[PDB]
Amino acid sequence: SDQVTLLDFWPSPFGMRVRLALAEKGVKYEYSEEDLWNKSALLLQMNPVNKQIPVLVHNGKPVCESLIIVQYIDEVWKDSAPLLPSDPYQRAQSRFWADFVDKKIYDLGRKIWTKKGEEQEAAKKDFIDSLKLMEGELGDKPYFGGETIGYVDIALVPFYSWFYAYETIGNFNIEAECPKMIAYCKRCLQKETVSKALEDPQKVYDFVLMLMKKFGIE
């Protein structure tokens, strides 16, 4: 009747974003695993600008970038509640915080396990401040999108999959500094859509241990 395809790689938090969006909005689709070393002809022709995953393919037209995909899902499949607020203002706030996750959480998270020594130390410090800022925005609400899970939650919660990696490689403990965030991420894991879309934390960690060796930054 139209069909959709998601080109993804199991441990990508960016890909889990789109997996969760599609779940929440009830969209049926086939999932196509990729090899980041052996990129498919489909991948190259669908995202010829970045040759990266995820890519949502809708009736033969591609959409690139996890966050933009989510928004597209949200604007095209409207049988379920919107994931972004309808109010211009709040929506602007969601975009900011969903974006905050890319610019801060991912960027600093990646430095924790790629960098070393004092630099790695710096990366851990900013990482925690960033989570705390997000903790502020969450306040007392059950989700970032209020009583319902919404855009920002979809942006944020896939990264729990990578928390164990960070902590272990970076030698710090998140829950210690951010009890409220961890509690949030667990309250989310109990949603079936969330637990399914996410991947196993120690499976993720092994995969990073492997990655570190193939680049020599052990």
Ligand X SMILES: N[C@@H](CCC(=O)N[C@@H](CS)C(=O)NCC(=O)O)C(=O)O
Which parts of this chain interact with its own copies (CB under 8 A)?
49, 58, 61, 63-65, 68-69, 71-72, 75-76, 88-89, 91-92, 95-96, 99-100, 133
Question: Does the CA dihedral 143-147-152-157 come out positive or negative?
Answer: positive
Amino acid at 18: V
Q: What b/e readout covers 128-146, taking b as 16+ CB neighbours within 10 angstroms?
A: bebbeebbeebeeeebbbe
61 labeled binding residue: no
The one of its own copies, ligand X, none whose footprint includes residue 100, by CB under 5 to 8 A per kind, is its own copies
207 binds, among ligand X, its own copies, none (CB under 5 to 8 A by kind): none
Pick one of its own copies, ligand X, none as the site partner of residue 164 (Cβ within 5 to 8 A by kind).
none
Rounded to whole angstroms, how far apart are CA atoms 202 and 16?
16
**Residue 51 found at the interface with ligand X (CB under 6 A):** yes
Which listed option, its own copies, ligand X, none, makes contact with residue 51 (CB within 5 to 8 Å by class)? ligand X
> 89: which 2 tokens?
């203002």
Residue 66 engages ligand X in binding (rule: CB under 6 A): yes
Q: Is 52 annotated as a binding residue?
A: yes
Q: Which is nearer to its own copies, 88 or 216 (CB)?
A: 88
Which amino acid is located at 93 in the chain? Q
Quote the CA–CA distance of 189 and 157 in Å, as a whole number: 9
Give the residue ranges of the annotated binding site for glutathione: 39, 52-53, 66
